[PDB]
Structures are given as structure tokens and as C-alpha cells.
Amino acid sequence: IGKHVKGYHYIIANLGFTDGDLLKIQFGGAEVSGFQIVDYDDSLVSKFIE
Amino acid sequence: TAINVGNINNDKKDETYRSLFQDLELKKERRVILDCERDKVNDIVDQVITIGKHVKGYHYIIANLGFTDGDLLKIQFGGAEVSGFQIVDYDDSLVSKFIE
Fold this sequence. Notes:
Chain A has about 50 residues and is of the alpha+beta class. Helix content of chain A is about 15%, strand content about 10%. Chain A has a two-stranded parallel sheet.
């Protein structure tokens, strides 16, 4: 329905932002904020992901 | 505003396409004609949905004899008007006896 252009602004209220597929609205123009408890940038998780 | 969309490789396809509509944003272009092979249509249609240039305000014209031969249900609920051309009439009884 196209309600993701520049003007809308969504909030993902779970501790897993990068856990689901979100590239789909990566270029729509709307803003998207979320929460991440598993910081894939932390060193321990990087050795885990490998 | 004729833009040669033909010469593009597949690896840098997403970059030159957003840059094509940030070049179509200079003119605030809301009316676009495609006139391309049916395969290159669905590629163009897809990137259009990702940037969001299919809501109420845009109008596309598909210049090929295969309007219903591609997928149109995707850009069916955005808001933009879309037009094209069809040669195969699926309401005629001759094609009906052929489709059956």
C-alpha cells in the first residue's frame, strides 16, 4: 500500500532488530528505529558468528 | 527526458537506478514511459517499489504489447496510475477455446 515513503516513521519493539529481514524498507524513505540486545559488533559475538 | 537505460551491468544495477531517479527527481518527474523488453520491465518496476515512487502521484506507461504478460499485482495497491498495451484479448471466444 506504499505507506513507507518519506514521512512515516516506525518503531520495532523487540530486542532483535537485525534478526529479521529489514533490507525491504532500507530505501523506502521512511525512518525505522529498533532495539538490539545482541551487539554483533561486540568482539565475543564476532568470534561466535564465525 | 529520454534516458538511455540500456547500458547497465548487473553488479552496479541498484546504484545507477537510484541515481536515475535522483536524476528524475531534479525534474520532479512524475510521468515516465518505459518502452523496454518485458524482462527489463519487472526489474525497473521492482526498484521503483523499493524507493517508493509508486504512491498517489506517479503515472507510468508501459510501451510494449505485453501489459498483462508480466506481473502487475505488485504495483496494484501503491496509488500510482499505470498504463500499457495489450494485443491478446482474453475475452474473445477464440482465445478462450485456446486457453481452456
